[PDB]
Amino acid sequence: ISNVPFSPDCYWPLNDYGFGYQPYRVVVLSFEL
Amino acid sequence: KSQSVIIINNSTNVVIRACNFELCDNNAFN
């Protein structure tokens, strides 16, 4: 969850989503056996 | 700027906490 400028040794790396297709909500369930 | 976890016990109690921390040598958010 770090926000630092990205030097590819080309700037802020967090792209924003466009309200492309309709957004989806995803839940992943993991089980310990 | 990076997540970090501390696992410290104070004299009776064990506390584990994973946040963004300032770290000292020789506050806390998210």
Ligand SMILES: *[C@@H]1O[C@H](CO)[C@@H](O)[C@H](O)[C@H]1NC(C)=O
């Ligand atoms: C220190 O111990 C007390 C109880 O003995 C506890 O309530 C407190 O949370 C502990 N300190 C930290 C920083 O967790």
Ligand SMILES: *[C@@H]1O[C@H](CO)[C@@H](O)[C@H](O)[C@H]1NC(C)=O
């Ligand atoms: C805490 O995280 C969020 C995203 O997870 C970020 O936008 C925010 O800047 C962080 N807090 C601080 C004080 O940087």
